[PDB]
């Protein structure tokens, strides 16, 4: 019955005007969940792969930020063990002036330019500074193994 006009109107413009390289569509049961696929950007270790993302809008959206997580297993220093993503904004806060589009774009640039220097608590950050040349290829291998078909 009721779901905010902002979600309705934003979902409209997301399917009518999608961003180059990304597919995003509402789940048919709960329209707050979004099945996302991002094509691995050109001349990146993840080139050729296609990565599936669950984007969820909590009840408090757009006063509260969405939560995003990788469903396709991926080798990247900014990804959780469960696939979750930062979305943390530096010396600012999520306001309803920022959209899902900006979220999807930031995740798209995050693949194009991983930032190992962040939380070192996971090993993938350690290998992404120690032997970066050897982290590019094991990410190419995980692209073939899990991001193809």
């Amino acid at each position: 019955a009721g779901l905010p006009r902002r979600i309705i109107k934003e979902t409209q413009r997301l399917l009518a005007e999608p961003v180059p390289g990304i597919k995003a569509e509402p789940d048919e049961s709960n329209a707050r969940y979004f099945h996302v696929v991002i094509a691995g950007p050109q001349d990146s270790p993840f080139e050729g792969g296609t990565f599936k993302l669950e984007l969820f809008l909590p009840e408090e959206y757009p006063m509260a930020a969405p939560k995003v997580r990788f469903m396709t297993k991926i080798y990247h220093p900014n990804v959780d063990k469960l696939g979750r993503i930062c979305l943390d904004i530096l010396k600012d806060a999520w306001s309803p002036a920022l959209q899902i589009r900006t979220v999807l774009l930031s995740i798209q640039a995050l693949l194009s330019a991983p930032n190992p220097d962040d939380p070192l608590a996971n090993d993938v950050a350690e290998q992404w500074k120690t032997n970066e040349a050897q982290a590019i290829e094991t990410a190419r291998a995980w692209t073939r193994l899990y991001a193809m078909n």
Partner: protein, 76 residues
Amino acid sequence: GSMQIFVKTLTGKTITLEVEPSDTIENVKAKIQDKEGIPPDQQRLIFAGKQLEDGRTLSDYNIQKESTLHLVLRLR
């Protein structure tokens, strides 16, 4: 209704604020800035292990006179 709360850092330093249960966490960050020179965007505040959010008030967290918050200066 000026009560008194404390703010401790990892270095052992204690800071004494004059506040009211009405004031927002953002307000006490601005009082930390007045005493320490730390900009509000450069600090987080913890009470009994719970991260405090900016819009909520001291009463919203049952923070009362002589309570001790903990200044957090890395991002968790």
